[PDB]
Amino acid sequence: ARSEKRVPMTRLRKRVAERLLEAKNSTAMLTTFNEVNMKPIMDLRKQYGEAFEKRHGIRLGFMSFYVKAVVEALKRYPEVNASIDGDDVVYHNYFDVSMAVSTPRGLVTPVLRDVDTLGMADIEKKIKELAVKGRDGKLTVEDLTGGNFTITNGGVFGSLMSTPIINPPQSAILGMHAIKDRPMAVNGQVEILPMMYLALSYDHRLIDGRESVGFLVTIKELLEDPTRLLLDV
């Protein structure tokens, strides 16, 4: 009936909205974009999916490819794997990557620890585990604290492209989006490819234009041809 409904914010949500605002005003976030042809990865899933699941007992998804690419990019650009703490820059000699998971009570980012030591099947398993816990609200504070970088996937909701927000106190975040067929120029000919836009938001106080672009280009190259991870080129 009444034309307006006023609902008080809980004390928790009070200092949650009053934190991203503090952190968002404490960093110089910028966003850089690129695109990636997902055909190669989609073909690998179709060609080896059955045999992969039979051998590992887990389905080969897209996330393990993203994680592997992010780890390698994190190794090539240590500045992005770092954080700013007071008057110090803290470089991390390990690789923890936060992964956004939608829970009935919002969005949370459980941490995948030492992802650089995990094989692809193991990454898919950990992701499924954390996803299940965050689905049944059994995620612990231990599971949620930490991470040197974050990967969020809005493509599940049909997002074309967007500006992801940095996850405090990390220095950058990778936003994945929907994969959509789009006409592309390939060797002088136009052919339709399953394209996905990538967005990397980064704290310009620590990461410059050159490194943010190079970091995203590295992810693009490793996704368009996973074999590059083996050759290291």
Add this chain to the structure above:
Amino acid sequence: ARSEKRVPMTRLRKRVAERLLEAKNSTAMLTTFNEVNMKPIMDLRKQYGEAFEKRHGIRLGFMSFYVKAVVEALKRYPEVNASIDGDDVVYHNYFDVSMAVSTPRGLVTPVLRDVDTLGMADIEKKIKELAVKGRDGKLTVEDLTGGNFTITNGGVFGSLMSTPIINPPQSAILGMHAIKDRPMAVNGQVEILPMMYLALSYDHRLIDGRESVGFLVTIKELLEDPTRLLLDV
């Protein structure tokens, strides 16, 4: 002659520039994007334009379609139709939408009240009325205050895509852009379609990634096929 001209800012403009800065630093604005095929709407205007004007005494434009789509999206995502006031979230049980109109003295946003009760012809009429007033500076403070959301159209100036700024104290804004022919993938074939990019800037303190994307996807679906408004799918 002099290499520099210093012009003092009026006292009004003083606290106008000193407000968007205050509000812009008080919110966590982010922007998400999508695209829409305007062919269906352009065909409806060509097919029914003449008969529409004869029956209603007003031309069928693009804006009434946008408003109808925004209202439905506002109904499906009440969080976007809300505002943050102090420690409270104010949900609005009505639909007022601010509409950006270029005036000889800048840009203003007159409000379309209870747009959800207006038929398309009635929406086009109100828009033309407010546009005329804002064109002859006869817009009153009453006409300018309020609104739960804003729609701004930069396409008039040839804009491809941009980041619109939130209109205080609203929580989100939809930026429309130029309609340009672009090769698209349609059922395995490449065909040229009149495409327009959409930008939705939103206050992340209140609207999360999932809702901002879902809200924009809803607008996209209702514009690519207005009939969906009738079926409610």
Add this chain to the structure above:
Amino acid sequence: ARSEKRVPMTRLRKRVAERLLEAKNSTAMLTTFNEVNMKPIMDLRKQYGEAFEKRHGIRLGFMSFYVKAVVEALKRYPEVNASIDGDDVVYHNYFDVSMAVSTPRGLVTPVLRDVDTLGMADIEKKIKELAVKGRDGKLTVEDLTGGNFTITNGGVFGSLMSTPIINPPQSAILGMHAIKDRPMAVNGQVEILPMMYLALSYDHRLIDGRESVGFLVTIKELLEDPTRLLLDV
């Protein structure tokens, strides 16, 4: 060995990171985008490159075209050529344009002074000079102070599109990106063109949506057909 390496920030870098943050929170930066077909300029370089170098003793690059376009846009939109100083708006009756150059010790922006008086060959020479100095760290404080606008080129690193950050105390910045073949709609037919996205970040306190879009559209028009600079249309 240790899983973390803490490195103190120098006092200089202390108030460098503690400045872009101050300035970034003191302005209302927004970003607008567009795209440009570089085929015409690429054809001019191929057709006249040899004769240009023989007559001027310098190679005809892309930058002189960008500078010429930016100057003309700066003339058509004086608001963008201005700055905000306290309660005053300072309009500049000259044209100094900062140019981002990557140096072994970071990124710096030497200033091209009175670029509106320089011919294209002269612009290419000045750019090469400043680039060399900034390459051997022989850039003076005089060379680095000033500028009414900035042009930064991330395309060198393969950037598709991004949000450039405003260079204090200027009011806007133009970000150039990589040139990539992309299928486009040309006279009802699809043809592959060398496309580049453009990004213009601007201080909304001084520049409105209409002027930011018009400014970028002007650059686009002058780059897609440099002859327009002669006709002034």
Add this chain to the structure above:
Amino acid sequence: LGMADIEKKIKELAVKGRDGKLTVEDLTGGNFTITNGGVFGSLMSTPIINPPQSAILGMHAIKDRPMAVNGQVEILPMMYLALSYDHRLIDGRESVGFLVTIKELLEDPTRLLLDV
């Protein structure tokens, strides 16, 4: 009622009238009637007015039939419509206009949104 709500009410009444649980309240009233003989394969017919209403719309079977479309012949799923009306109250012009309106809104439901 929204479209989903209309389909639900129709299914409800259909079930009741199928199990004879339709009440006199459910059966009295109505300003107009819609009857569908197409379920039985009817091509076209003259429906009879439901007292004390003034008109009734008869729907029939949908059958593929060659039609003229932009100078070309193409097969379309066509259905004949019949509107019986009490001429004491409704004249030729209004009966025809009423049926033409139904035809236009069915051939392009979007017209309901534009109101044209």
